[PDB]
Amino acid sequence: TQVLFEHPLNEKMRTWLRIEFLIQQLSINLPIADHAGALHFFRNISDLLDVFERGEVRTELLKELERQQRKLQAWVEVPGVDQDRIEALRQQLKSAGSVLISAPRIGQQLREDRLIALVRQRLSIPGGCCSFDLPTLHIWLHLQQAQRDAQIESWLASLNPLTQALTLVLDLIRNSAPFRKQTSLNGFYQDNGDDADLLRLMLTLDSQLYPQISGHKSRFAIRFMPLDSENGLVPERLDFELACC
Amino acid sequence: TQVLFEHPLNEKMRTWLRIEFLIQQLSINLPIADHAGALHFFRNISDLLDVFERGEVRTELLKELERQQRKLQAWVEVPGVDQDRIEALRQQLKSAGSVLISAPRIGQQLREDRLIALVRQRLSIPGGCCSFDLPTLHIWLHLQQAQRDAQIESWLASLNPLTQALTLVLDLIRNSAPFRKQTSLNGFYQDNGDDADLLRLMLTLDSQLYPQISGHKSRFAIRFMPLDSENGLVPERLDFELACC
């Protein structure tokens, strides 16, 4: 019955959410045995390289990892807390930091890759791929699965530093704040998110509504819209769950 | 061991080959249960609508269907031929013609669709989709599978007139000409394709080569390239299969 919507409260978080999604898509389609899986894969790599242009990802991740290490050392002197958890999270953060800092430039390996670049040029064209548009991709798919699997794995491994860091920080952020019940009157709602990075919002599918979140800096505004824009009525009162992370 | 490459000898055939591929991709991913399958689906619809701008698809298909009906009535007075096949193919062509001619404007239904248009706007953006970029798509995926399946089926049904016609003509074209053995000396080859619409070219994967087909009108030229552009050697003689359709 429940539906989770997340919203970034800054441009950094918007970037990070996109990267998360794209990297999840790359892990979900192995093994790659046809054009469908292949085009899907390369589209997501191409989009990922384009998302990287929105900010300095490595830089912001190195800062956030340490910041999370700082936000962890407040929880040290708190009875009831597992100190093995704290030390383990600290160690994960530290390792992610030094892996990330030592790693090559983010996805330079992916840009330089001849097969990736080749496919990347053709995605712009509407009927982008076919044996006649992409012969190199066509022959690649006639190889044995293990030759592709190995090529795929080295591509994904070069993203591991980023993946490890991002998985870490977003998980910590997502668990940094609890959900709280709120009410919208006549489909409208607004508040200062403070300097939270992420909104997390739960509705029911039985409401047959969806949120459209506006805002300028942090002061967010929500309009709860129906799916059917003729038949759909907005309730005069709606309760929902909200966490500001 | 064998690898089939096809090449269009005109802009019409290039269009048609792309449409074929895209429509195959739309049929291969049902049922749609997540963002991966959904984005894949909508990307292919969006690309299909863009391919339609390359020519008058309905028009060219109506002509080709009749032309195929004409090319069939030569085979009528040929002993050894099944006359049930001929009459059945004729009847399939005729039906495809009148279905296509009676159908609405090709994929106008798809352009007008609110959900398609909505998603279409967001594909331009690098990290195109997430619950925050596409809330309407997010809620759509929380529905029960049958609500999506029904929506998908009506979308695919509106393409049936095109699909039926195109499947027909391309199959007939592909079988209009037999494969013949040819030889390339030092990775090069050239000939007049006449006014053939399609080249069909078979190589072996063990050759570890691929064709790059040039040309101006019909006079085609082929360079057989290695995959590895340093280690790769081109044989002084290469035999391959070729059909001009």
CSV table of C-alpha atoms in Angstrom, one decimal:
chain,number,residue,atom,x,y,z
A,1,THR,CA,0.0,0.0,0.0
A,2,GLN,CA,2.8,2.4,0.8
A,3,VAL,CA,4.9,4.4,-1.8
A,4,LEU,CA,8.2,6.1,-1.0
A,5,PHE,CA,9.2,9.4,-2.7
A,6,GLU,CA,12.6,11.0,-2.1
A,7,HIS,CA,13.5,14.6,-3.0
A,8,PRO,CA,17.0,16.3,-3.0
A,9,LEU,CA,17.2,19.6,-1.2
A,10,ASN,CA,20.4,20.6,-3.0
A,11,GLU,CA,22.2,20.1,-6.3
A,12,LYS,CA,24.8,17.8,-4.7
A,13,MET,CA,22.1,15.3,-3.4
A,14,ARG,CA,20.3,15.4,-6.8
A,15,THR,CA,23.6,14.4,-8.4
A,16,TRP,CA,24.2,11.7,-5.9
A,17,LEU,CA,20.7,10.2,-6.2
A,18,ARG,CA,21.0,10.0,-10.0
A,19,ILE,CA,24.4,8.3,-9.6
A,20,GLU,CA,23.0,5.8,-7.2
A,21,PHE,CA,20.1,4.9,-9.5
A,22,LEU,CA,22.4,4.6,-12.6
A,23,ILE,CA,24.9,2.4,-10.7
A,24,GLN,CA,22.0,0.1,-9.5
A,25,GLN,CA,20.9,-0.2,-13.1
A,26,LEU,CA,24.4,-1.3,-14.2
A,27,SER,CA,24.4,-4.1,-11.5
A,28,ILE,CA,20.9,-5.4,-12.3
A,29,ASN,CA,21.4,-6.5,-15.9
A,30,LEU,CA,24.4,-9.0,-15.8
A,31,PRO,CA,24.8,-11.2,-17.7
A,32,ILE,CA,24.7,-9.2,-21.0
A,33,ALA,CA,23.7,-11.6,-23.9
A,34,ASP,CA,21.8,-9.4,-26.4
A,35,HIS,CA,21.3,-5.9,-27.8
A,36,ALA,CA,18.5,-5.2,-25.2
A,37,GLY,CA,20.8,-5.8,-22.2
A,38,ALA,CA,23.8,-4.2,-24.0
A,39,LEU,CA,22.1,-1.0,-25.1
A,40,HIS,CA,20.6,-0.7,-21.6
A,41,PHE,CA,24.0,-1.1,-20.1
A,42,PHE,CA,25.8,1.4,-22.3
A,43,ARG,CA,23.0,4.0,-22.0
A,44,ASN,CA,23.4,3.9,-18.2
A,45,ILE,CA,27.2,4.3,-18.5
A,46,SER,CA,26.8,7.2,-20.9
A,47,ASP,CA,24.2,8.9,-18.6
A,48,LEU,CA,26.5,8.3,-15.7
A,49,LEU,CA,29.4,10.1,-17.4
A,50,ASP,CA,27.0,13.0,-18.1
A,51,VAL,CA,25.8,13.2,-14.5
A,52,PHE,CA,29.5,13.5,-13.4
A,53,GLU,CA,29.6,16.8,-15.2
A,54,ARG,CA,27.1,18.3,-12.8
A,55,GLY,CA,29.6,18.6,-10.0
A,56,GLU,CA,32.8,17.4,-8.4
A,57,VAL,CA,31.7,14.0,-7.1
A,58,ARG,CA,34.9,12.7,-5.6
A,59,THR,CA,35.5,16.0,-3.8
A,60,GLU,CA,32.0,16.2,-2.2
A,61,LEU,CA,32.2,12.5,-1.3
A,62,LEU,CA,35.5,12.8,0.5
A,63,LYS,CA,34.1,15.7,2.6
A,64,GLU,CA,30.8,13.9,3.4
A,65,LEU,CA,32.7,10.7,4.5
A,66,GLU,CA,34.7,12.6,7.0
A,67,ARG,CA,31.6,14.6,8.0
A,68,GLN,CA,29.9,11.3,8.7
A,69,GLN,CA,32.9,10.2,10.7
A,70,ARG,CA,32.4,13.4,12.8
A,71,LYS,CA,28.7,12.8,13.1
A,72,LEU,CA,29.6,9.3,14.4
A,73,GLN,CA,31.9,10.4,17.2
A,74,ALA,CA,29.0,12.2,18.9
A,75,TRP,CA,27.3,8.7,19.3
A,76,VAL,CA,30.4,7.3,21.0
A,77,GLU,CA,29.5,8.4,24.5
A,78,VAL,CA,25.9,7.0,24.4
A,79,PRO,CA,25.0,4.0,26.6
A,80,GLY,CA,22.8,1.5,24.7
A,81,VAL,CA,24.9,1.8,21.5
A,82,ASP,CA,26.9,-1.1,20.2
A,83,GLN,CA,30.5,0.1,20.1
A,84,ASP,CA,31.4,-2.6,17.6
A,85,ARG,CA,28.9,-1.0,15.1
A,86,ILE,CA,30.5,2.4,15.6
A,87,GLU,CA,34.0,1.2,15.2
A,88,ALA,CA,33.0,-0.8,12.1
A,89,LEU,CA,31.2,2.1,10.5
A,90,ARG,CA,34.2,4.3,11.3
A,91,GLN,CA,36.5,1.8,9.7
A,92,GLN,CA,34.3,1.4,6.6
A,93,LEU,CA,34.2,5.2,6.2
A,94,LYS,CA,38.0,5.5,6.6
A,95,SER,CA,38.6,2.8,4.1
A,96,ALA,CA,36.2,4.3,1.6
A,97,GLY,CA,38.0,7.6,2.0
A,98,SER,CA,41.5,6.3,1.3
A,99,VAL,CA,40.3,4.0,-1.5
A,100,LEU,CA,38.5,7.0,-3.1
A,101,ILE,CA,41.4,9.4,-2.6
A,102,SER,CA,43.9,6.9,-4.1
A,103,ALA,CA,41.6,5.9,-7.1
A,104,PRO,CA,42.1,7.3,-10.6
A,105,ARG,CA,40.0,10.1,-11.9
A,106,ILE,CA,36.4,9.1,-11.7
A,107,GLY,CA,35.4,7.2,-14.8
A,108,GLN,CA,38.3,8.4,-16.9
A,109,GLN,CA,38.9,4.7,-17.6
A,110,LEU,CA,35.3,4.6,-18.9
A,111,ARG,CA,35.7,7.7,-21.1
A,112,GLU,CA,39.0,6.3,-22.6
A,113,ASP,CA,37.5,2.8,-23.3
A,114,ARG,CA,37.2,2.4,-27.1
A,115,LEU,CA,34.1,0.3,-27.1
A,116,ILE,CA,32.3,2.7,-24.7
A,117,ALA,CA,33.2,5.8,-26.7
A,118,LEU,CA,32.1,4.1,-29.9
A,119,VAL,CA,28.7,3.2,-28.6
A,120,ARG,CA,28.4,6.6,-27.0
A,121,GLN,CA,28.6,8.3,-30.4
A,122,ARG,CA,25.7,6.3,-31.8
A,123,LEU,CA,23.2,6.7,-28.9
A,124,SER,CA,22.5,10.3,-30.2
A,125,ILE,CA,21.0,8.8,-33.4
A,126,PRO,CA,17.3,7.9,-33.0
A,127,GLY,CA,17.5,4.2,-34.2
A,128,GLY,CA,20.9,4.2,-32.6
A,129,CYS,CA,22.0,0.6,-32.9
A,130,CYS,CA,21.8,-2.3,-35.3
A,131,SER,CA,24.5,-4.4,-36.9
A,132,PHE,CA,24.8,-1.7,-39.6
A,133,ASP,CA,25.0,1.2,-37.1
A,134,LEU,CA,27.2,-0.7,-34.6
A,135,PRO,CA,29.0,-3.6,-36.1
A,136,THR,CA,31.6,-3.6,-33.3
A,137,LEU,CA,28.8,-4.1,-30.7
A,138,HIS,CA,27.2,-6.8,-33.0
A,139,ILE,CA,30.4,-8.9,-33.0
A,140,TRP,CA,30.9,-8.3,-29.3
A,141,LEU,CA,27.6,-10.0,-28.7
A,142,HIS,CA,28.7,-13.1,-30.7
A,143,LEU,CA,31.6,-13.7,-28.4
A,144,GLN,CA,31.3,-16.2,-25.5
A,145,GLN,CA,29.6,-14.9,-22.4
A,146,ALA,CA,32.8,-15.1,-20.3
A,147,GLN,CA,34.6,-12.6,-22.6
A,148,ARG,CA,31.8,-10.0,-22.0
A,149,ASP,CA,31.5,-10.9,-18.3
A,150,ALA,CA,35.2,-10.1,-17.8
A,151,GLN,CA,35.0,-6.8,-19.7
A,152,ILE,CA,31.9,-5.8,-17.7
A,153,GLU,CA,33.5,-6.7,-14.4
A,154,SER,CA,36.6,-4.5,-15.0
A,155,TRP,CA,34.3,-1.6,-16.0
A,156,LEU,CA,32.2,-2.0,-12.8
A,157,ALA,CA,35.4,-2.4,-10.7
A,158,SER,CA,36.7,1.0,-11.7
A,159,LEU,CA,33.5,2.4,-10.2
A,160,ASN,CA,33.8,0.5,-7.0
A,161,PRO,CA,35.6,3.4,-5.1
A,162,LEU,CA,32.7,5.7,-6.0
A,163,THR,CA,30.1,3.0,-5.4
A,164,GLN,CA,31.4,2.1,-1.9
A,165,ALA,CA,31.6,5.7,-0.8
A,166,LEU,CA,28.1,6.7,-2.1
A,167,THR,CA,26.3,3.6,-0.8
A,168,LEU,CA,27.9,4.4,2.6
A,169,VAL,CA,27.0,8.1,2.8
A,170,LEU,CA,23.4,7.8,1.4
A,171,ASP,CA,22.6,4.9,3.8
A,172,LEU,CA,23.8,7.0,6.8
A,173,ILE,CA,21.9,10.1,5.6
A,174,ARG,CA,18.7,8.0,5.0
A,175,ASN,CA,19.0,6.7,8.6
A,176,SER,CA,20.0,10.1,10.1
A,177,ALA,CA,16.4,11.1,10.7
A,178,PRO,CA,13.2,9.3,11.6
A,179,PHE,CA,9.8,9.5,9.8
A,180,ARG,CA,7.2,11.8,11.4
A,181,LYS,CA,3.5,12.1,10.6
A,182,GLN,CA,2.2,15.3,9.0
A,183,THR,CA,-1.0,16.6,7.4
A,184,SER,CA,-1.7,18.5,4.2
A,185,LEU,CA,-4.8,20.6,3.9
A,186,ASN,CA,-6.3,20.9,0.4
A,187,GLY,CA,-3.3,19.2,-1.2
A,188,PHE,CA,-0.8,21.8,0.0
A,189,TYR,CA,2.2,21.7,2.4
A,190,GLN,CA,5.3,23.7,3.1
A,191,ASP,CA,8.2,24.0,5.6
A,192,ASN,CA,11.9,24.9,6.1
A,193,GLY,CA,13.9,21.7,5.6
A,194,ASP,CA,16.7,23.5,7.5
A,195,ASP,CA,20.0,22.4,5.8
A,196,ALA,CA,18.8,18.9,5.3
A,197,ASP,CA,20.1,17.2,2.1
A,198,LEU,CA,17.1,14.8,1.5
A,199,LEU,CA,13.4,14.7,1.8
A,200,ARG,CA,11.7,11.3,2.2
A,201,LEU,CA,8.0,11.1,1.8
A,202,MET,CA,5.6,8.2,2.1
A,203,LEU,CA,2.0,8.0,0.8
A,204,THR,CA,-0.5,5.2,0.2
A,205,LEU,CA,-1.3,4.0,-3.3
A,206,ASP,CA,-4.9,3.8,-2.2
A,207,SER,CA,-4.9,7.7,-2.0
A,208,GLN,CA,-4.2,7.7,-5.8
A,209,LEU,CA,-2.1,10.8,-5.4
A,210,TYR,CA,1.5,11.9,-6.0
A,211,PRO,CA,3.7,14.8,-4.7
A,212,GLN,CA,5.2,17.6,-6.8
A,213,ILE,CA,7.9,19.2,-4.7
A,214,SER,CA,9.0,22.8,-5.4
A,215,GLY,CA,11.3,25.1,-3.4
A,216,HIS,CA,14.2,27.6,-3.8
A,217,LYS,CA,16.9,26.7,-1.2
A,218,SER,CA,15.4,24.5,1.5
A,219,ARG,CA,11.9,26.0,2.1
A,220,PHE,CA,10.1,23.2,0.3
A,221,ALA,CA,6.5,23.2,-1.0
A,222,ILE,CA,4.4,20.1,-2.0
A,223,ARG,CA,1.3,19.8,-4.2
A,224,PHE,CA,-0.4,16.4,-3.9
A,225,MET,CA,-1.7,15.7,-7.4
A,226,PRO,CA,-4.1,13.0,-8.6
A,227,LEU,CA,-2.9,10.7,-11.4
A,228,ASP,CA,-6.1,11.2,-13.4
A,229,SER,CA,-6.2,15.0,-14.0
A,230,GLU,CA,-10.0,15.1,-14.6
A,231,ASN,CA,-11.6,12.4,-12.4
A,232,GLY,CA,-9.0,13.0,-9.6
A,233,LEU,CA,-10.1,14.8,-6.5
A,234,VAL,CA,-7.7,16.1,-3.9
A,235,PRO,CA,-8.7,15.3,-0.3
A,236,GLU,CA,-9.4,18.3,2.0
A,237,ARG,CA,-7.1,16.5,4.6
A,238,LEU,CA,-4.3,14.1,3.9
A,239,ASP,CA,-1.9,12.5,6.3
A,240,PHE,CA,1.5,11.2,5.3
A,241,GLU,CA,4.9,10.4,6.5
A,242,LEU,CA,7.9,12.7,6.3
A,243,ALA,CA,11.6,12.5,7.2
A,244,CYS,CA,14.0,15.4,6.6
A,245,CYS,CA,17.6,14.1,6.3
B,1,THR,CA,30.7,-19.6,-35.8
B,2,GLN,CA,28.8,-17.4,-38.3
B,3,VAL,CA,27.8,-13.7,-37.9
B,4,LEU,CA,25.2,-12.0,-40.0
B,5,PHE,CA,25.6,-8.3,-40.9
B,6,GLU,CA,22.9,-6.4,-42.8
B,7,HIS,CA,23.3,-3.1,-44.5
B,8,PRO,CA,20.6,-0.8,-46.0
B,9,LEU,CA,21.2,0.4,-49.6
B,10,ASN,CA,18.8,3.3,-49.3
B,11,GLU,CA,17.4,5.6,-46.7
B,12,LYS,CA,14.0,3.9,-46.7
B,13,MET,CA,15.6,0.5,-45.8
B,14,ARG,CA,17.7,2.2,-43.1
B,15,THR,CA,14.5,3.6,-41.6
B,16,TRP,CA,12.7,0.2,-41.9
B,17,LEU,CA,15.6,-1.7,-40.2
B,18,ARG,CA,15.6,0.7,-37.3
B,19,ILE,CA,11.8,0.4,-36.9
B,20,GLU,CA,12.1,-3.4,-36.9
B,21,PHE,CA,14.7,-3.4,-34.2
B,22,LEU,CA,12.9,-1.0,-32.0
B,23,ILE,CA,9.6,-2.9,-32.3
B,24,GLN,CA,11.4,-6.1,-31.4
B,25,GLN,CA,12.8,-4.4,-28.3
B,26,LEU,CA,9.3,-3.3,-27.2
B,27,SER,CA,8.0,-6.9,-27.5
B,28,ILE,CA,10.9,-8.5,-25.6
B,29,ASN,CA,10.6,-6.8,-22.2
B,30,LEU,CA,7.0,-7.6,-21.1
B,31,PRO,CA,6.0,-7.7,-18.3
B,32,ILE,CA,7.2,-4.3,-17.0
B,33,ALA,CA,7.8,-4.4,-13.2
B,34,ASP,CA,10.5,-1.9,-12.4
B,35,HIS,CA,12.4,1.2,-13.6
B,36,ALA,CA,14.8,-0.8,-15.7
B,37,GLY,CA,12.2,-2.4,-17.8
B,38,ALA,CA,10.1,0.8,-17.9
B,39,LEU,CA,12.9,3.2,-19.0
B,40,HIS,CA,14.0,0.6,-21.5
B,41,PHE,CA,10.4,0.5,-22.9
B,42,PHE,CA,9.8,4.2,-23.0
B,43,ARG,CA,13.3,4.9,-24.5
B,44,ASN,CA,12.4,2.6,-27.4
B,45,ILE,CA,9.0,4.3,-27.9
B,46,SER,CA,10.7,7.7,-27.9
B,47,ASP,CA,13.4,6.5,-30.4
B,48,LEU,CA,10.6,5.0,-32.6
B,49,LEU,CA,8.7,8.2,-32.8
B,50,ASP,CA,12.0,10.0,-33.8
B,51,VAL,CA,12.7,7.4,-36.5
B,52,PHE,CA,9.3,8.1,-37.9
B,53,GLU,CA,10.5,11.6,-38.8
B,54,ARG,CA,13.0,10.2,-41.3
B,55,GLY,CA,10.4,9.4,-43.9
B,56,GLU,CA,6.8,8.7,-44.7
B,57,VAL,CA,6.6,5.1,-43.3
B,58,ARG,CA,3.0,4.3,-44.0
B,59,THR,CA,3.3,5.6,-47.6
B,60,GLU,CA,6.4,3.6,-48.5
B,61,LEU,CA,4.9,0.5,-46.8
B,62,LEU,CA,1.7,0.7,-48.8
B,63,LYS,CA,3.7,0.8,-52.0
B,64,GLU,CA,6.0,-2.0,-51.1
B,65,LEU,CA,3.1,-4.3,-50.1
B,66,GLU,CA,1.6,-3.9,-53.5
B,67,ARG,CA,5.0,-4.2,-55.2
B,68,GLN,CA,5.4,-7.5,-53.3
B,69,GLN,CA,2.0,-8.6,-54.5
B,70,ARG,CA,3.2,-7.9,-58.0
B,71,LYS,CA,6.5,-9.8,-57.5
B,72,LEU,CA,4.3,-12.7,-56.3
B,73,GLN,CA,2.1,-12.9,-59.4
B,74,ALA,CA,5.2,-13.8,-61.5
B,75,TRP,CA,5.7,-16.9,-59.4
B,76,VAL,CA,2.1,-18.0,-60.1
B,77,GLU,CA,2.9,-19.8,-63.4
B,78,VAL,CA,5.7,-21.9,-61.9
B,79,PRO,CA,5.3,-25.7,-61.5
B,80,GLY,CA,6.8,-26.9,-58.2
B,81,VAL,CA,5.4,-24.0,-56.3
B,82,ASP,CA,2.7,-24.5,-53.6
B,83,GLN,CA,-0.3,-22.4,-54.8
B,84,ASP,CA,-1.7,-22.4,-51.3
B,85,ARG,CA,1.4,-20.5,-50.1
B,86,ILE,CA,1.1,-17.9,-52.9
B,87,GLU,CA,-2.6,-17.3,-52.3
B,88,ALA,CA,-2.0,-17.1,-48.5
B,89,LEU,CA,0.9,-14.6,-48.9
B,90,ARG,CA,-1.2,-12.6,-51.3
B,91,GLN,CA,-4.1,-12.6,-48.8
B,92,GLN,CA,-1.7,-11.5,-46.0
B,93,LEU,CA,-0.3,-8.7,-48.1
B,94,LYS,CA,-3.8,-7.5,-49.1
B,95,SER,CA,-5.0,-7.6,-45.5
B,96,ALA,CA,-1.9,-5.7,-44.3
B,97,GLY,CA,-2.5,-3.1,-46.9
B,98,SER,CA,-6.2,-2.4,-45.9
B,99,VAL,CA,-5.4,-2.6,-42.2
B,100,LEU,CA,-2.6,-0.1,-42.7
B,101,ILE,CA,-4.6,2.2,-45.0
B,102,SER,CA,-7.5,2.3,-42.5
B,103,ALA,CA,-5.4,2.7,-39.4
B,104,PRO,CA,-5.0,6.1,-37.7
B,105,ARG,CA,-1.9,8.3,-38.3
B,106,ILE,CA,1.2,6.2,-37.3
B,107,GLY,CA,1.8,6.6,-33.6
B,108,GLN,CA,-0.2,9.7,-33.2
B,109,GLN,CA,-1.9,7.8,-30.3
B,110,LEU,CA,1.6,7.4,-28.8
B,111,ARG,CA,2.5,11.1,-29.2
B,112,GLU,CA,-0.8,12.1,-27.6
B,113,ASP,CA,-0.5,9.7,-24.6
B,114,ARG,CA,0.1,11.8,-21.5
B,115,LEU,CA,2.3,9.3,-19.7
B,116,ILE,CA,4.5,8.8,-22.8
B,117,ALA,CA,4.9,12.5,-23.4
B,118,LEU,CA,5.8,13.1,-19.8
B,119,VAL,CA,8.5,10.5,-19.7
B,120,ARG,CA,9.7,11.7,-23.1
B,121,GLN,CA,10.5,15.1,-21.7
B,122,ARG,CA,12.7,13.7,-19.0
B,123,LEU,CA,14.8,11.3,-21.2
B,124,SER,CA,16.8,14.4,-22.4
B,125,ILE,CA,18.1,14.9,-18.8
B,126,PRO,CA,21.3,12.8,-18.1
B,127,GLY,CA,20.1,11.1,-14.8
B,128,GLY,CA,16.7,11.2,-16.4
B,129,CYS,CA,14.5,9.2,-14.0
B,130,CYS,CA,14.0,8.7,-10.3
B,131,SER,CA,11.0,9.1,-8.1
B,132,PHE,CA,11.9,12.9,-7.9
B,133,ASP,CA,12.4,13.3,-11.6
B,134,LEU,CA,9.4,11.1,-12.6
B,135,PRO,CA,6.9,10.7,-9.7
B,136,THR,CA,4.1,9.7,-12.2
B,137,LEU,CA,6.3,6.8,-13.5
B,138,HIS,CA,7.1,5.9,-9.9
B,139,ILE,CA,3.5,5.5,-8.8
B,140,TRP,CA,2.7,3.7,-12.1
B,141,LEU,CA,5.2,1.0,-11.1
B,142,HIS,CA,3.5,0.5,-7.7
B,143,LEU,CA,0.2,-0.4,-9.4
B,144,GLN,CA,-0.7,-4.1,-10.0
B,145,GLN,CA,0.9,-5.8,-13.0
B,146,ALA,CA,-2.4,-6.1,-14.8
B,147,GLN,CA,-3.0,-2.3,-14.9
B,148,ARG,CA,0.4,-1.9,-16.7
B,149,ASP,CA,0.0,-5.0,-18.9
B,150,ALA,CA,-3.3,-3.6,-20.2
B,151,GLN,CA,-1.8,-0.1,-20.9
B,152,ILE,CA,1.2,-1.7,-22.6
B,153,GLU,CA,-1.0,-3.9,-24.8
B,154,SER,CA,-3.1,-1.0,-26.1
B,155,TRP,CA,0.1,0.9,-26.9
B,156,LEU,CA,1.5,-2.1,-28.8
B,157,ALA,CA,-1.8,-2.8,-30.6
B,158,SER,CA,-1.8,0.7,-32.1
B,159,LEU,CA,1.5,-0.3,-33.8
B,160,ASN,CA,0.1,-3.6,-35.1
B,161,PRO,CA,-0.8,-2.2,-38.5
B,162,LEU,CA,2.8,-1.0,-39.0
B,163,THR,CA,4.3,-4.1,-37.4
B,164,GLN,CA,2.3,-6.5,-39.6
B,165,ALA,CA,3.2,-4.7,-42.8
B,166,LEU,CA,6.9,-4.3,-42.0
B,167,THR,CA,7.4,-7.9,-40.7
B,168,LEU,CA,5.8,-9.0,-44.0
B,169,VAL,CA,7.8,-6.9,-46.4
B,170,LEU,CA,11.2,-7.4,-44.8
B,171,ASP,CA,10.7,-11.2,-44.6
B,172,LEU,CA,9.9,-11.2,-48.3
B,173,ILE,CA,12.8,-9.0,-49.2
B,174,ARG,CA,15.2,-11.1,-47.1
B,175,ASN,CA,14.1,-14.2,-49.0
B,176,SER,CA,14.1,-12.5,-52.4
B,177,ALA,CA,17.7,-13.3,-53.0
B,178,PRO,CA,20.1,-16.2,-52.2
B,179,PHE,CA,23.5,-16.1,-50.5
B,180,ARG,CA,26.5,-16.4,-52.8
B,181,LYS,CA,30.2,-16.9,-52.0
B,182,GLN,CA,32.6,-14.0,-52.6
B,183,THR,CA,36.2,-13.2,-52.0
B,184,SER,CA,37.9,-10.0,-50.6
B,185,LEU,CA,41.6,-9.4,-51.4
B,186,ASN,CA,43.5,-7.4,-48.7
B,187,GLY,CA,40.3,-6.6,-46.8
B,188,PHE,CA,38.7,-4.8,-49.7
B,189,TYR,CA,35.6,-5.4,-51.8
B,190,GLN,CA,33.2,-3.4,-54.1
B,191,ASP,CA,30.3,-3.9,-56.5
B,192,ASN,CA,27.1,-2.4,-57.8
B,193,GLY,CA,24.2,-3.6,-55.7
B,194,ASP,CA,21.9,-2.6,-58.6
B,195,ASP,CA,18.7,-1.2,-57.0
B,196,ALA,CA,18.7,-3.7,-54.2
B,197,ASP,CA,17.4,-2.4,-50.9
B,198,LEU,CA,19.4,-4.6,-48.6
B,199,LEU,CA,22.9,-6.2,-48.2
B,200,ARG,CA,23.2,-9.3,-46.2
B,201,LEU,CA,26.7,-10.4,-45.3
B,202,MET,CA,27.9,-13.5,-43.3
B,203,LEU,CA,31.4,-13.9,-41.8
B,204,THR,CA,32.9,-16.2,-39.2
B,205,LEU,CA,33.7,-15.1,-35.7
B,206,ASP,CA,36.9,-17.1,-35.9
B,207,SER,CA,38.1,-14.6,-38.6
B,208,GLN,CA,37.9,-11.9,-35.8
B,209,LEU,CA,36.9,-9.3,-38.4
B,210,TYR,CA,34.0,-7.0,-39.1
B,211,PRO,CA,32.7,-5.1,-42.1
B,212,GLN,CA,32.5,-1.3,-42.6
B,213,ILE,CA,30.3,-0.6,-45.6
B,214,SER,CA,30.5,2.7,-47.4
B,215,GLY,CA,28.9,3.7,-50.7
B,216,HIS,CA,27.1,6.6,-52.4
B,217,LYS,CA,23.9,5.3,-54.1
B,218,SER,CA,24.2,1.5,-54.6
B,219,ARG,CA,27.9,1.0,-55.6
B,220,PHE,CA,28.9,-0.3,-52.1
B,221,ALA,CA,32.4,-0.7,-50.7
B,222,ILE,CA,33.5,-2.9,-47.8
B,223,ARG,CA,36.5,-2.8,-45.5
B,224,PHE,CA,37.0,-5.9,-43.3
B,225,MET,CA,38.5,-4.5,-40.1
B,226,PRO,CA,39.9,-6.4,-37.1
B,227,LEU,CA,38.5,-5.8,-33.6
B,228,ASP,CA,41.9,-5.2,-32.1
B,229,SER,CA,43.2,-2.2,-34.0
B,230,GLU,CA,46.9,-3.0,-33.2
B,231,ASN,CA,47.2,-6.8,-32.9
B,232,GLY,CA,44.7,-7.4,-35.7
B,233,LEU,CA,45.9,-8.5,-39.1
B,234,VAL,CA,43.7,-8.5,-42.2
B,235,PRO,CA,44.0,-11.7,-44.3
B,236,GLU,CA,45.3,-11.3,-47.9
B,237,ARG,CA,42.3,-13.4,-48.9
B,238,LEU,CA,38.9,-13.7,-47.2
B,239,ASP,CA,35.9,-15.6,-48.3
B,240,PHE,CA,32.4,-14.7,-47.1
B,241,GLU,CA,28.7,-15.0,-48.0
B,242,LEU,CA,26.8,-12.2,-49.7
B,243,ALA,CA,23.1,-11.7,-50.7
B,244,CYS,CA,21.9,-8.5,-52.4
B,245,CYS,CA,18.2,-8.1,-51.7
